[PDB]
Design a binder for this molecule. Structure first.
Ligand SMILES: CC(C)COC(=O)N[C@H](C(=O)N[C@@H](CC1CC1)C(=O)N[C@@H](CC1CC1)C(=O)C(=O)NCC(=O)N[C@H](C(=O)O)c1ccccc1)C1CCCCC1
Ligand SMILES: [Zn+2]
Ligand SMILES: [Zn+2]
Lengths: 16, 151, 22, 181
């Protein structure tokens, strides 16, 4: 198997 | 926007990874020696430390690195896979106590996530929750120094 | 002299967030 | 929650020049700290209790461009090295610190928060020194206590061989004094 990225978290809450 | 924390998944379970110093770190008990997916194909771990329950691959795309803590503060903050922040008082090198204990469910899937200080800098990587009868009152963590050392 | 102009901003009130899949 | 920050450029070189001359800025404002520029330099301005404060050595006595044209300064204190304009509509203000903490966190124009240990009413030392070039552009930026409250505004850096190890700042107390002056 392989580790896949299913999402991300931005600590500053930056919308941009 | 780039993220410091990647929400990752393996066949068995889902957890977190945190980019620090250009390396995407996570817990060996979640990834093992597994490789990480990329548009160019599986990229192998740069560091694997079964002892410290620490593995690391080079930082993925759409990510940004977190800065290690240098203020020594013991007022930590754990970030969960749901982006929830949990105040934690540092009890020791790799131990901290929730200021308000939560059900293990609340901290579930967050291993690999970051333990932040008041400046939002990485203090450690969430190792495992220490719970008494289903309520997590403390956490076990890998200090950034171990990461700094390992690399 | 010319006026001081706002060319950007720095936001402190942001909380951790899961980047939306768009 | 820990202090985290992000930056956003809302305007470029040519839009900035026109706006400086025009004095009319129609752009929407958000945030506690504004990245600010004159034709000569770029620095920071912090909104505290409804007033957008900055360093006099950067703003001088200039007006601030707003959607209604230039806005004259509310407070000017060459001695305190402070100037203040009414906070722009859309900004959010920080409130002064009330915990007497000596562990401050300087927010830079790149949205990085760096720890500094208070060593007097107007000085603190970086727990981790940085090149002076990294601190350039941050004058007028906030020094926050662990709770996210304004303790002071970055003013000058104490550096040697091009490395800053300490920072000189304007304590909020001087703000209250300037307002009643
Ligand atoms: C009080 C005691 C600590 C004495 O120390 C100093 O005076 N130090 C100076 C100092 O900090 N002076 C102040 C002014 C004097 C009155 C107090 C200053 O320039 N502060 C700057 C921040 C500088 C120290 C890092 C602040 O006003 C500011 O950011 N100004 C805007 C600016 O630098 N704009 C540049 C520009 O617009 O071109 C810029 C922007 C981004 C990147 C590079 C350059 C240092 C200046 C840089 C070289 C080393 C010495
Ligand atoms: Zn720290
Ligand atoms: Zn305070």
């Amino acid at each position: 198997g392989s580790v896949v990225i299913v999402g991300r978290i931005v600590l500053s809450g930056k919308p941009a | 926007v780039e993220g410091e924390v990647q929400i990752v998944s393996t066949a068995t379970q889902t957890f977190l990874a945190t980019c620090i110093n250009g390396v995407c770190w996570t817990v060996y008990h979640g990834a093992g020696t597994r490789t990480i997916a990329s548009p160019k194909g599986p990229v192998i771990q740069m560091y694997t430390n079964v002892d410290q329950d620490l593995v690391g691959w080079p930082a993925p795309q759409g990510s940004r690195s977190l800065t290690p803590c240098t203020c020594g503060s013991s007022d930590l903050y754990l970030v969960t896979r749901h982006a929830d922040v949990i105040p934690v008082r540092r009890r020791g090198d790799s131990r901290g106590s929730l200021l308000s204990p939560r059900p293990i469910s609340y901290l579930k899937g967050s291993s690999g996530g970051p333990l932040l200080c008041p400046a939002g800098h990485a203090v450690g990587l969430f190792r495992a929750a220490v719970c008494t009868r289903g309520v997590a009152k403390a956490v076990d963590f890998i200090p950034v120094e171990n990461l700094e050392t390992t690399m």
